[PDB]
Amino acid sequence: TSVKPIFSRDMNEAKRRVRELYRAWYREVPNTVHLFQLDISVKQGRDKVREMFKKNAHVTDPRVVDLLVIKGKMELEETINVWKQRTHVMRFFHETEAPRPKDFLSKFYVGHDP
Amino acid sequence: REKMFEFYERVSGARMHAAYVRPGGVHQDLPLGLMDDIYEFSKNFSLRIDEL
Amino acid sequence: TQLITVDEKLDITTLTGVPEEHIKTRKARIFVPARNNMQSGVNNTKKWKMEFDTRERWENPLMGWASTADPLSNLVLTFSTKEDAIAFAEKNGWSYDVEERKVPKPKSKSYGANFSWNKRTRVSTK
Amino acid sequence: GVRTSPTGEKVTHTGQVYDDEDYRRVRFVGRQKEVNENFAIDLIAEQPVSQVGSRVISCDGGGGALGHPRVYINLDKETKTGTCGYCGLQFRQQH
Amino acid sequence: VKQDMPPVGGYGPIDYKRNLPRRGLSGYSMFAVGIGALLFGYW
Amino acid sequence: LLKKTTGLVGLAVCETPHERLKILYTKILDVLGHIPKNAAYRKYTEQITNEKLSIVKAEPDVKKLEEQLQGGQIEEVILQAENELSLARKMIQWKPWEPLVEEPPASQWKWPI
Amino acid sequence: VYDQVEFDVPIGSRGDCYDRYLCRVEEMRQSIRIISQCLNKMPPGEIKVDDA
Amino acid sequence: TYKYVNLREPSMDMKSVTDRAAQTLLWTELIRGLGMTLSYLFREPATINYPFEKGPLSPRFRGEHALRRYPSGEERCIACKLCEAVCPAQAITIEAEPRADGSRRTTRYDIDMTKCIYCGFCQEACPVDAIVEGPNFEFSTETHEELLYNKEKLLNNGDKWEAEIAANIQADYLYR
Amino acid sequence: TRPTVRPRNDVAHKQLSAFGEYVAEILPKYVQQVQVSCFSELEICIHPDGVIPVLTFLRDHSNAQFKSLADLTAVDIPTRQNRFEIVYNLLSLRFNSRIRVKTYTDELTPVESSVSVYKAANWYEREIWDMFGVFFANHPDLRRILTDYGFEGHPFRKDFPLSGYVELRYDDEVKRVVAEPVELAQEFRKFDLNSPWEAFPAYRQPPE
Amino acid sequence: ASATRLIQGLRNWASGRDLQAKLQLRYQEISKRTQPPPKLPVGPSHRLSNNYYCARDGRREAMPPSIVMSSQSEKKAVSPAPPIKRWELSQDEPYL
Ligand code: SF4
Ligand code: SF4
């Protein structure tokens, strides 16, 4: 159970790195809304950032959150340096995707998926 | 380069993607008269390199 | 030191890029595949396989082809032991069920038993 | 040997034709349903049965290597002809 | 057998070296022609 | 004879190749004396470096030294001497004559699975 | 069979675009040379391995 | 076994220096290049008059697909699905059943011509020369699903091009 | 066994065996296995803490001089707990030879980047990040190289499906190329091709 | 080939080469588009005797890799092969 760390020796350094990545994304959202000339608000983009951070909020392994911070830094570098187009930014907003049936009864009505 | 694609097409049937060299050899034998035309190409191709 | 102690369960589900619909609603089946009874060879019964529950295949309105929406419909994985398959499914957050390996039990064969003096095991023809 | 459904649609040599209430006939509106009017089941019936003087006949489809793999047909049944499983030609022992 | 083969004596020789055939006057001669054209024009 | 070029781009011609090779080989041996004696890197590198140094000290010519050191041009023999020197200085820090740090898992190099 | 054909390898001197241009032009020359040697030394026989 | 491209020292006598200076000031190699371009100006071009003149093809050419027949009208395809097993792009879709005379025949023989890589592995996997890749290359469509051939379209391509396909196979079957 | 069988090269087999013993005894700290294939290819299977010391050895040692990195490769083998097998193909132009250096990692243990040994690796292991998710410590600019910019998932992992999880199309409502869950109009047809009979008895594994 | 000798002479002067000896357009020197039928040979395994497959089985002579070292005196330092022989300069055209 002795594993080689990526960056963080424990979870507190890991939470420090998660926190600095969230600060950098939070600062980046108005510039991303502006220069990609998006149709969303700055508040809605910061909501999407908060949603994507809370999506991974159950991880207890320091190496897994180190890789999550590394991949978030990579997505941030692809956003700041304008390497993504507008479409890659707007793929976080699943807008053309119709909303899926969530309860039992509508999933029963549409088909066979549990 | 068009004439060498004709060589590919005479030996395989496709001008570019021949699928001709296979594990075990080649797929099909040379058709008759192909080596004569490869000679006729090579006899003149040095002048093309010279004018390039 | 240069080695940390992570006492947590190994979970890479946030790193695989698999969407949530295909992590938590899938049932992985871990099994040694049965011998095809059209044939006597057993070399396809040597490894453990992981597959998933088959989802909906429907008819293409244009050509009648089999249209699917399941990305995992062809994902068959090969494992040397049962525990490697169990560990791979637990690492990926897949709910799994395991069928144990069915071996053929050792038969008792005797060519002379085809011609017994007093047993029912005589062959009427050969 | 093509026939026609009451919808006016040609039945293919498989036997495929859309129903009247099937919406997929709309793909042929202003266009055509391409069928082949040379039914192989109707053309292989038109061949004469070959009367041979042997008990086992061989068929390759003709043309040598331009036909099918060479199979051997037994002709012991005098009730029924011996049909090649590839080309559909059929054979009868002449006795 | 009948197979795509070279002829009995093989094919003929094939040129494969560089041939830039060295044409033109000398540098002395070309400057002489140019200066002579200038002198004719000036006269 | 003062070779005009080495033929390799960026590999400059050495004016005095014999003295540079003697300096580099004795420097390799001086670095290599700080490795334990039973280490195979030390025994093998002392062996090949003493062979090359005796070949250098036995031949005054540059061309014949190139054809019997058998490592190409004399300047890339100098480059390989510099590379061996840098390598041995790193091999002091790495200490790779130690036992194996960790056995692999039981079926890590089993192919096919 | 490249150990049985005879050809030369063009070698640059300055590591630049121009010597690499000249290396490719001379490799076209040497390819014409190898094609001549292949057309003269083409052997009879089968073209797939005779392991079916 | 190697040669040195560009390892020439230019001569430094006054003759060669004045040659290089007449090249620099009088543009001699530029006139050489203009001469070679002028030399192609007066050549007959290599341009064929398409569509009236056609590019030369061989009998091995791999164009449009066709299901063939015997010389009795019976279709050669006996539904063995070797062509769709070998098909590297999975372009061939085959369904079969015994038909009314009990013969092993297909009810579906589809080829997606926009998956097809035109490599002809189907016509060499075929044991009875049923599927071939014929000589037609001029079959561009205006719609994507016009390139989704079913069995009817492929049998009609066979009936359309059979007089040519049989002669191409007659030319190349002793190489196969 | 003359015409159709590949001729065996015994001289290269003996020489690569001698050099494999050589490398195994110069570097016993990291060398785990040494093997030579029947077609004479040497593989040095090492511990992943010795990526830099072994590769620096083979690049710089006067009996090795493996100056060229031909190819750098990962292999997903999901039945191993260290599922990723990192492969370094190396070329010595001085001794006209090739060597293979193989190591391993799982999803979370980083491998040390070999850009300090071979700069050629700068993209290769970068691709091993993109295709397999193997992180490389102290890489200069480690990011994706082949996938799309918003691409989730490491595709050459063998649990990644052939078609992905998303597919693109243009949508004229949003005037934009969008990503949706993949629906195939024709499913990829999985063929179970493997024969139930043993093909190579020399490779028979001992049973349980 | 149908060029007049005035245009042919101007063309050969401008190129500096005898272009008619090596034309890039093809004429009656090429092969016929209809060839006689081949009789292709057979390989060495087309024999009726002494042709057992086990005596020419290439796939079944491949072995697993010989494990030279595994982790379960004055011997000569070796290299993976002898040092490469220096290439010789071309007698054909060294450009020297
Ligand atoms: S030519 Fe190739 S890709 Fe096309 S249908 Fe035949 S086998 Fe498939
Ligand atoms: S076309 Fe040929 S290979 Fe394909 S199913 Fe028919 S008979 Fe078999």
Ligand SMILES: [Zn+2]
């Ligand atoms: Zn028949």
